[PDB]
Ligand binder design. Structure first.
Ligand SMILES: NS(=O)(=O)c1ccc(NC(=O)NCCO)cc1
Ligand SMILES: NS(=O)(=O)c1ccc(NC(=O)NCCO)cc1
Ligand SMILES: [Zn+2]
Length: 257
């Protein structure tokens, strides 16, 4: 199956998922000079106070923290969105070196990693239905640069040794995702896709201008995860990012000047 290696990586995905060459694929390069300030964009509303994290999982492509999405506990609204979107999970994409790892780029600059907080539109009832709709998901993307540690990330980093290989999971309750957010909620937004198969064109992307800083020790712990399962040849889970895709007939809008 699909992955990030030489014979199954992003350049191969279109053979099983032909929408990979579609009209609204993600990620993209955010050319900050060409993005247009849209004063009609509302501030983003992030309501995570009642979030209920449940589990952390190595899925063979990333690690994800999953939340109770059976009620409006952690929701994203406002910004470019109409209606309410429930947080389902977050995960990361990262590199083998600090100069690569993000999926979106900013003026061609790559960050060391990118956090995706994945939300689905409650009017569609469940995430599997939402992925079939052009406005089904809203993913909040946050860049990670390497410098000072992010204290709110540490609880995540410290459990990664218990989910080293594909398929491992652990209980992961009481995690507050507000500890992962930068100060500013200024954002760029554009219509796009899932960045992993099935690459469905169902995402309103909301990418924050302000990166968070994580420490070298924190990102090193990401790089000790494995793509493989136990008993299989060890392949470090690094460079699990899709490169920027053609913007085609899309404009990126900025909530800020
Ligand atoms: N989804 S995808 O990137 O188009 C893909 C799917 C299966 C493969 N299969 C494969 O590489 N099989 C060899 C097994 O050991 C490769 C690429
Ligand atoms: N990397 S990404 O664009 O944030 C992403 C988010 C969700 C998914 N998939 C998902 O939510 N599947 C649930 C329904 O099948 C895949 C990729
Ligand atoms: Zn992602």
């Amino acid at each position: 199956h699909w992955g990030y290696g030489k014979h199954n990586g992003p350049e191969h995905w279109h053979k099983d998922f032909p929408i990979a060459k579609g009209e609204r694929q993600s990620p993209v390069d955010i050319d900050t000079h060409t993005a247009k300030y849209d004063p009609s964009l509302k501030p983003l509303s992030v309501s995570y106070d009642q979030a209920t994290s449940l589990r952390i999982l190595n899925n063979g492509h990333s690690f994800q923290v999953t939340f109770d999405d059976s009620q409006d506990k952690a929701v994203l609204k406002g910004g470019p969105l109409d209606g309410t979107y429930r947080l389902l999970q977050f995960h990361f994409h990262w590199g083998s070196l600090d100069g690569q790892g993000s999926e979106h780029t900013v003026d061609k600059k790559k960050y060391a990693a990118e956090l995706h907080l994945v939300h689905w539109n409650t009017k569609y009832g469940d995430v599997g239905k939402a992925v079939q709709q052009p406005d089904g998901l809203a993913v909040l993307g946050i860049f990670l640069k390497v410098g000072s540690a992010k204290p709110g990330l540490q609880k995540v980093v410290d459990v990664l040794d218990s989910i080293k290989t594909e398929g491992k999971s652990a209980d992961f309750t009481n995690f507050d995702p507000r500890g992962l957010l930068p100060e500013s909620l200024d954002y760029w937004t554009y219509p796009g896709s899932l960045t992993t198969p099935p690459l469905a064109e169902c995402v309103t992307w909301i990418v924050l201008k302000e990166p968070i800083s994580v420490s070298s020790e924190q990102v090193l712990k990401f790089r000790k995860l494995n793509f493989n399962g136990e008993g299989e040849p060890e392949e470090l889970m690094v460079d699990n990012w899709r490169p920027a895709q053609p913007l085609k007939n899309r404009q990126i809008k900025a909530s800020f000047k």
